[PDB]
Amino acid sequence: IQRTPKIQVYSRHPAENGKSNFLNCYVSGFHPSDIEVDLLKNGERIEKVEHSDLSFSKDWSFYLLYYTEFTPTEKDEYACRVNHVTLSQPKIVKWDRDM
């Protein structure tokens, strides 16, 4: 079977301009495991991005955490781009400081 991924974009610590932090993109509930996840800075892909080791839940659906070290500003925009076999086109989830 196939399962579409749920997406959550957020920072490890409460966002504060000028203060070093971590930007996370958590993808879960998907199947198969092959998936493309990118963190974007003002629409551009970030290179220094890492991810946790592939694991899965009780229902067998997969989950992965992609993260990058960043410093939020009042202007710079961040987002997570996700593409999977179940998606017609890449999905983009913008980062909201309050979520």
Binding site: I1, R12, N24, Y26, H31, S52, L54, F56
Partner: protein, 275 residues
Amino acid sequence: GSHSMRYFFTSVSRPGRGEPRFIAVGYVDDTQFVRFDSDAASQRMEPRAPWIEQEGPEYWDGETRKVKAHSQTHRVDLGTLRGYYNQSEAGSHTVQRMYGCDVGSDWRFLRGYHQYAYDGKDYIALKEDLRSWTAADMAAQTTKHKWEAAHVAEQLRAYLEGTCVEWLRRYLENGKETLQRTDAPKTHMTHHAVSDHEATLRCWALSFYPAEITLTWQRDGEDQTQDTELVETRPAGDGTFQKWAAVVVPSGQEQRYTCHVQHEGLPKPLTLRWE
């Protein structure tokens, strides 16, 4: 104060060229301590927690040897299953396996498990009695009959009730500084006006461990699910977890609403209310 140890294995076939991608991870409660990735350069079981690096060479050599034996079995299985289901050789498929044991608050064996899936759906699993098998279909049925004749359950039961529990306790002691410590959620509430007459209250739970938690909204002392939103628990990335619950309310009536937080690290549940 119950605990558990679990191993997760995923194998994906690659018909175009080469062997399947194999990834294995080990966990104690909600803490990952080992991993193996066939795509990695070491070709060895690797540490993912400080307290596991205390183990000597024989440990890592034995775990490496064993995890590779796991990948080969999964490689063979992918082939066997392609036949059972009469599937093409041009498509990619997935086999998953998860097994482990739990110890109760008395630190004694509580339960064991060994489940298997093919393409994201249950295939075969060891029942709680650790003696019988649950097969999802006729393909799984053939596997069940073969494992019953080979007495595979008896061998697993010895591991789950013995070896498994013994090492879980060993790990719990060696990494007691973290594994046996609960991190109470750090909570606060934010207020966001959505219109001139409505506002959103968001109840935050941060940096907590283990992951298990419950967030609930009450209005004038009564649970409310209407006009609320609860996101799935997520990893902070530093070993802890996060979660939040929000509710839309009439501006000026924020005082009627309370957020209740239940977590193992809280002697008694916390109640938050807007300023």
